[PDB]
């Protein structure tokens, strides 16, 4: 009814070609977005307005023909030029126009970083499909990468100099680890700490994504051990610094998903820890394995009359859970009640933890590795280093991941090549720790 | 000959199209070799060179190009679901972005890279107005490399900096060397064009702030100004600004910086954001306009003077009796030296028809139907209006030779800005006063 | 007993006269030695004794004056020249400047002297206060520092610094820690202290730049604030600042955060530096008070709930038939019910006593504040401070402070002190010269009504 | 009419003395004080001031008795100390009331110290005379130096990227070379070159003193040299830096006299060049002599020279030698006469030894340049004919311009000597003039 006659008097039309090189009529779509309580209501907006204002499907094929029309002949680097750009230009969606115009407006990019991530949750909620969605979203973000591309960003350090506005952010939308109070934020960007954020250059101090790392001895196998420290406040000794682990990384801004803005953090904080400490050569994240829990659960089934444990491993199980196995333990798996039973722990940990090394490394979604957190050090050239059990004791990451947190290892003078063979050849490069893992996985499923 | 070799182990490869969204590793590396090589090139001919080698060599796919069209023709035969259509277009669309912007847009990212690019275009711009490099694929280059800077240097990526005598003497020098339209005097002048009733402002890239990129000055007045002397040539009592004594604001020196940045912007963000920031100061403060110099004008004169109409009878009777000579025979000399003025019996003659010329010059004169003079473009496409037309506005030996000492005003209406600009830009029409109507209507004679 | 050996090495010597203007080279090292040791002594009575050696043997020489006197009196025997008199009366002005000043002036040059100078000046008045120090040399020497530390911190060299949510968390700790009349609650809690419709200021050295010396929070209000919890306990709905509905400005805590410059300063500028500073944001806003507390009331109170018993159950605090209606409520005598229930802070509890309790109250604090004195100077210390600066003693507000903290120390009563920006200097000379104090009539009224029946 | 009227409204009276520990009597003051347009106006206010409102030299003379009374007796430290803080009190002048006042006023110590420059100009220019004006001056000057002491002021650095404002400030008030232009401000404060100031702690990037620092190979004999150099541009090598040259030093604010605020701005640039150039270790000035002709000139009234050297100097002048000279050295024209320049070599030199070394004002040695860095511990170190050939130069000094030295190990010491024993420090070239003088 609404929502239709708004969309076509706030989109400009698309000028006939000519005379391509409506300001007004911006404020108007943006004054209206902002008056939609429910997310719902965004979703319908935003995929109305996805689909009647795409491409022109004919006017691309049109132009296509004409570049055919043009090879046939080969006429002049000039007049195939033209036609070429005729078809780039039939080839711009419709609003793209829109979005163009908003972010030459006052509060426009902040609006446009906003409506992505408005977007990009009707998505995953799946009240907004097809493939007209999905083109949009592509859009935004493409505008999006420009806007924040790695030269515009400034590396912020986060100290208890920093203002209070900055604190209270980055343990707001901390989106791993809670924190308990103030006491703790003062420990936690304190002594043998470094927090590091990236802002826009036209915005400092508001930050995008932040990383948070732990200077410490050896590569961390617990969270417990990090978060819960008393670190000494003897201030830094050089001598007993050999390892940075990187224990929170999380985007404050939703809309700069796929961005690459994570990547581009650990490798300018890098740069920055390797100039403060020049004798410092072990680069490593201590990360949770979100979706783990979901996965085995959703494993513990059925028909497929798919075989997880051994013999011996069965019997044992089931002699400590009252019933059969499947049952039992998709029950208390999912309510972390089985850690304060020792004899249940002991038992699930050879299965589970041979389970993990499959999960992150044999699974798949497209041939890249299903678990998001995977796919994202893997991509940055990371090795999927080791596997650690009961890690993660605290609630989310019981029912998370049964307690068990991965360590993705940077070995600088070869983040490159694994980069590319991540991403070219779909190859994983593991430890021998993990690769004995998925060996023991390998005799039964 | 080596040139070659460096643009193929420079510009980074088109990656496959599934890893399109992800920066390859060796990209950093590839570009900064390019930044290298291109920095290590002293004579501009070589750089141009290279420029042409590239627009060549690394534009477009012309063959994955043709084989995507076919591919989204053989798919619309058989009518097959959007999800399908959709992929195909995209695809098309990818190997129709050139690979030369992988180049820019991985140099950017660099450490000096957005510097770098701007340089670059000042050369292309410079490599194109010496018909050093010719071809649509350097035009092609050109719009690509424009497009990417404009984006770069969008209001939301500038810094509104304000100069004033407590400035560092590091920015003051900048801004007396970066003078475009009225050069400075002398320093006592350069303390009374940043000092009490004249503000000056510049806007910098929020990366490298303080760099100047657009200086505006503005003299703070009780009028529409119509004399550019009586601006810089006041001393006032030095008492700290009468705030009462403010009615309008005037806008009487624009200098871009950096000739690598030419017509990437728009330019209304660089008024309106300097009008917002005066508002706060002098909330009462109401009335905007520009006091523009002509360039072009005597030159276009003069160049139409060889035959023509023009002048009337009594006008023709008159300039000959006050000269001694014919007319255009007479006219022609006088006017092409600058001399002409030290007569105030030829001053006043000449008043009526000159103005009526100029009336013309600005609002009937057209290239591409877009007017002909670049200033008047400029404030039109802002959407300022044509306001009035000044005789002996800039009595220096620079203002009578560039424009027989002649000064538009563009007035801006904050209210009608938006409104004017589309009637300017998509119809090309010119608001004007009755003042330059009246002109126009008097030329529309002869 | 080595003390005595740095105090002859260390505290520089009294230069000729000729050479009286100019720095010694030596007194810079002389000077670091005196830092050197009074820093290493551990224990107060150490640096009590030294303070006591400093006084004795390097104050005035005794001999020189008494020389100088009899010249400045043989040359008036014999009426010589402006010339000659003014000079002899110069050596024996020189010869009066004490040699410890040479000693604090050669300090203040000093890398942290001026910090060191407010930390030694807290220990003179801790080794008195502690009758570890008695003395006319001791108090010689104080009145010296005081006078020297007076001209160090004279408006003109603090700055007015101002605390919000963009300040450091280091600043903030600060703050927070050397809060003095209310102490802070939680994190959330002081978010809101600095943001919408509250103020924090606080006075630093020009030199030691954001190191706080004095810490003012302001309550930006519709009318003349008469409750505390109606402050702290106050969230808005963080909607920034109205800038219509600010009729008036409450300073509801000041606190001084170095306790080796109590009362060196005057205050004057403490508020009205803090005024013209908030008029710039708000010129319309033309009203300000504070909102003070009562310390040493209910122990005032207490005290006299003693000595001041009576005959047959009455006495001098108490009207007969409000005598008659406490022990109605409470079930006992009087003047060891009072006692009782006033020194426990229970007695809020009962509505039927608070009611009761209030006429009377109301009519002992005022004169608390304006009739009883020390040295003819008003006994309340918030009070004189306020007083000095000009206040006018505007208004006592009942049931004003409901905390176990406000209840013990005042039963809950808090004083508005209100700063008429106009009146202020008439009202500071009638104050320090005088030892006059401005009361609103609804004091003078109270004052009136204890007068009426209460001779003590 | 007025003037005495205003001085007994606005001056408080003196306190009996018990209610010793007027805020809107000097507002009055300070207006009316402004509101004077000649500096002769100023002149009588101020000497008005200073005579009717000193001492109450009555209660002086009577407390002065009443210690000398206790003294027979010998009573309690308690009683004793008393009548000496009652001397104490009287001793102090009325007007210092008045002034301890302004200073806690809003522009106050600002107003102060203006005050105490317009005292400073009508003393020198004998509008005010005697020694109720000298005792207000020392009160002034002692209330400014506690307000003034090092510990409050910040050394600041003078480059190209400091505000216009203080390269014009330095530039103004610049006592002692001015600068032709902007051109040239550029490369006094450019590379091979240090112009440091301090501001108070309350108001930075306001200079009180300004020194300006030659980044040198050697001890520099010569001001055109540093003046009109072009120094490379060639950013700062750090091998060619040996010694560090002082050429202008100046006082902005004249109310700030004798604070010791020139010693302290060396002290502090010292140990910052130190810190900066740890293989530093010449340092000296390059210092005008002013007075020096004025000195001469007034010794030619009317033998300062030898036989052969006065029939030398008249066989040049075309009359005799104290009337020709007298007239000549007062006006720079005796330069392009190249005759008269080498013959006045040696005899200048040599008297010009002596004016530093030998002439003395309370036995410190009158030039007050000479009396500044002597005060310092510097070394009365070498003597440099025709160095300075400016206009005020030649007809301030002959062209002479004098080096003191600063050796750092020594500074401490030469201080004391020079203070306390009234010693000056002199090399053997300066010892070589003033003997050659002796044979006079
Ligand atoms: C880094 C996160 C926050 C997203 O980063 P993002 O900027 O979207 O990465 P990219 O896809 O843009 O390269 C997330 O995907 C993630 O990996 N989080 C946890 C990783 C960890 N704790 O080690
Ligand atoms: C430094 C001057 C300007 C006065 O300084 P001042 O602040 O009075 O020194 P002081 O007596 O306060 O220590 C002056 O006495 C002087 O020495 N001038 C020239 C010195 C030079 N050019 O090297």
């Not at 506005?165 to 791993?176: D, G, H, R």
Request: aromatic letters at 8%; one cysteine or more.
């Amino acid at each position: 009814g609404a929502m239709d006659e708004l969309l076509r008097r706030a989109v400009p039309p698309t000028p006939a070609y000519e005379l391509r090189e409506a300001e007004g009529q911006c404020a108007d779509f943006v004054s209206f977005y902002g008056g939609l309580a429910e997310t719902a209501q965004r979703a319908e907006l935003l995929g109305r307005l996805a689909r009647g204002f795409g491409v022109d499907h004919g006017q691309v094929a049109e132009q296509s023909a004409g570049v055919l029309h043009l090879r046939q002949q080969q006429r002049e680097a000039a007049v195939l030029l033209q036609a070429e750009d005729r078809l780039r230009y039939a080839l711009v969606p419709r609003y793209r126009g829109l979005f163009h115009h908003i972010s030459k407006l006052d509060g426009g990019v902040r609006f446009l970083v906003q409506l992505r991530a408005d977007l990009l949750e009707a998505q995953a909620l799946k009240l907004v499909e097809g493939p007209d969605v999905r083109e949009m979203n592509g859009v935004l973000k493409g505008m999006l990468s420009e806007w924040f591309s790695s030269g515009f960003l400034n590396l912020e350090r986060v100290t208890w100099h920093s203002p209070c506005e900055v604190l209270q952010k980055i343990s707001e939308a901390e989106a791993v680890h809670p924190v308990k109070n103030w006491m703790d934020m003062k420990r936690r960007v304190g002594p043998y700490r470094r927090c590091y954020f990236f802002s826009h250059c036209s915005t400092p101090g508001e930050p995008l994504v932040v990383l948070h790392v732990a200077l410490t001895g050896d590569i961390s196998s617990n969270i417990q051990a990090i978060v819960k420290e008393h670190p000494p406040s003897e201030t830094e000794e050089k001598n007993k610094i050999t390892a940075a682990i990187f224990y929170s990384i999380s985007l404050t801004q939703q809309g700069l998903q796929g961005v690459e803005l994570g990547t581009f953090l650990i490798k300018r904080v890098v740069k920055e820890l390797q100039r403060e400490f020049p004798h410092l050569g072990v680069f490593s994240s201590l990360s949770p394995i979100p979706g783990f829990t979901k996965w085995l659960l959703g494993l513990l089934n059925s028909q497929t009359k798919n075989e997880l444990f051994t013999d011996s491993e069965c019997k044992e199980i089931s002699e400590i859970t009252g019933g059969p196995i499947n049952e039992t333990l998709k029950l208390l798996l999912s309510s972390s009640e089985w850690v304060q039973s020792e004899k249940l722990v002991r038992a699930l940990q050879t299965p589970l933890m041979r389970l993990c090394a499959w999960y992150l490394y044999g699974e798949k979604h497209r041939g890249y590795a299903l678990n998001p957190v995977a796919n994202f050090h893997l991509q940055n050239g990371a090795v999927l280093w080791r596997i650690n059990w009961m890690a993660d004791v605290s609630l989310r990451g019981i029912t998370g991941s049964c307690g068990l947190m991965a360590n993705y290892r940077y070995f600088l003078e070869e983040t490159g090549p694994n980069s590319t063979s991540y991403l070219g050849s779909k190859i994983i490069k593991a430890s021998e720790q993990v690769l004995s893992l998925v060996a023991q996985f390998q005799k039964n499923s």
